[PDB]
């Protein structure tokens, strides 16, 4: 498996505008449109990204294109961020993928604040206390099963959680 397969699972694929866990307007593979309650705003943002006049419905191909752009963005956010680049650089392909998923979901800022818990999770002594911290984030509380899966991946460096 890889990052793509991983998010497709966690995000699912949706061709009509939907609302995430925070009730925000979203489409395709976890592509957030806007934080406003203006469906029009969402639509407008959509047609913009897409080009065409979508009416809030896109194709699997369009969704997939947005998906590839979004994964690239996450990677760049990581590499531009002073706290995460070094972590990333040193990681193996599986823990890189977990880290990308976090950024994908919560943004570079959110993730960078946990840098120390991340590095701690990677030690042998009390690595679990570090895991616990993230459990408490607003993250986990919103999407607890996805948080476990991702954290498990990040700790183990295997795909067991996927399974």
Curated annotation (Swiss-Prot):
<feature type="active site" description="Proton donor/acceptor">
    <location>
        <position position="20"/>
    </location>
</feature>
<dbReference type="InterPro" id="IPR023346">
    <property type="entry name" value="Lysozyme-like_dom_sf"/>
</dbReference>
<protein>
    <recommendedName>
        <fullName>Endolysin</fullName>
        <ecNumber>3.2.1.17</ecNumber>
    </recommendedName>
</protein>
<keyword id="KW-0326">Glycosidase</keyword>
<feature type="binding site">
    <location>
        <position position="104"/>
    </location>
    <ligand>
        <name>substrate</name>
    </ligand>
</feature>
<comment type="function">
    <text>Endolysin with lysozyme activity that degrades host peptidoglycans and participates with the holin and spanin proteins in the sequential events which lead to the programmed host cell lysis releasing the mature viral particles. Once the holin has permeabilized the host cell membrane, the endolysin can reach the periplasm and break down the peptidoglycan layer.</text>
</comment>
<feature type="binding site">
    <location>
        <position position="117"/>
    </location>
    <ligand>
        <name>substrate</name>
    </ligand>
</feature>
<dbReference type="InterPro" id="IPR023347">
    <property type="entry name" value="Lysozyme_dom_sf"/>
</dbReference>
<dbReference type="InterPro" id="IPR034690">
    <property type="entry name" value="Endolysin_T4_type"/>
</dbReference>
<keyword id="KW-0929">Antimicrobial</keyword>
<dbReference type="GO" id="GO:0016998">
    <property type="term" value="P:cell wall macromolecule catabolic process"/>
</dbReference>
<dbReference type="InterPro" id="IPR052619">
    <property type="entry name" value="Phage_lysozyme-like"/>
</dbReference>
<dbReference type="GO" id="GO:0044659">
    <property type="term" value="P:viral release from host cell by cytolysis"/>
</dbReference>
<keyword id="KW-0204">Cytolysis</keyword>
<dbReference type="InterPro" id="IPR001165">
    <property type="entry name" value="T4-type_lysozyme"/>
</dbReference>
<feature type="binding site">
    <location>
        <position position="133"/>
    </location>
    <ligand>
        <name>substrate</name>
    </ligand>
</feature>
<dbReference type="Pfam" id="PF00959">
    <property type="entry name" value="Phage_lysozyme"/>
</dbReference>
<feature type="active site" description="Proton donor/acceptor">
    <location>
        <position position="11"/>
    </location>
</feature>
<comment type="similarity">
    <text>Belongs to the glycosyl hydrolase 24 family.</text>
</comment>
<dbReference type="GO" id="GO:0003796">
    <property type="term" value="F:lysozyme activity"/>
</dbReference>
<dbReference type="GO" id="GO:0030430">
    <property type="term" value="C:host cell cytoplasm"/>
</dbReference>
<dbReference type="InterPro" id="IPR002196">
    <property type="entry name" value="Glyco_hydro_24"/>
</dbReference>
<feature type="binding site">
    <location>
        <position position="32"/>
    </location>
    <ligand>
        <name>substrate</name>
    </ligand>
</feature>
<keyword id="KW-1188">Viral release from host cell</keyword>
<keyword id="KW-0081">Bacteriolytic enzyme</keyword>
<dbReference type="GO" id="GO:0009253">
    <property type="term" value="P:peptidoglycan catabolic process"/>
</dbReference>
<dbReference type="GO" id="GO:0042742">
    <property type="term" value="P:defense response to bacterium"/>
</dbReference>
<keyword id="KW-0578">Host cell lysis by virus</keyword>
<keyword id="KW-1035">Host cytoplasm</keyword>
<keyword id="KW-0378">Hydrolase</keyword>
């Amino acid at each position: 498996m890889n990052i793509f397969e991983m998010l497709r699972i966690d995000e699912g694929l949706r061709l009509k505008i939907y609302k995430d866990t925070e009730g925000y307007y979203t489409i395709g593979i976890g592509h957030l449109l806007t934080k406003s309650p203006s469906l029009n705003a969402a639509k407008s943002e959509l047609d913009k990204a897409i080009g065409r006049n979508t009416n809030g419905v896109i194709t699997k191909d369009e969704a997939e294109k947005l998906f590839n752009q979004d994964v690239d963005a996450a990677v760049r956010g990581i590499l531009r961020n002073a706290k995460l680049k070094p972590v990333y650089d040193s990681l193996d392909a599986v823990r890189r993928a977990a880290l990308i998923n976090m950024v994908f979901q919560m943004g570079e800022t959110g993730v960078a604040g946990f840098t120390n818990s991340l590095r701690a999770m990677l030690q042998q002594k009390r690595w679990d206390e570090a895991a616990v911290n993230l459990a408490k984030s607003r993250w986990y509380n919103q999407t607890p099963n996805r948080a476990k899966r991702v954290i498990t991946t990040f700790r183990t460096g295997t795909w067991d959680a996927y399974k």
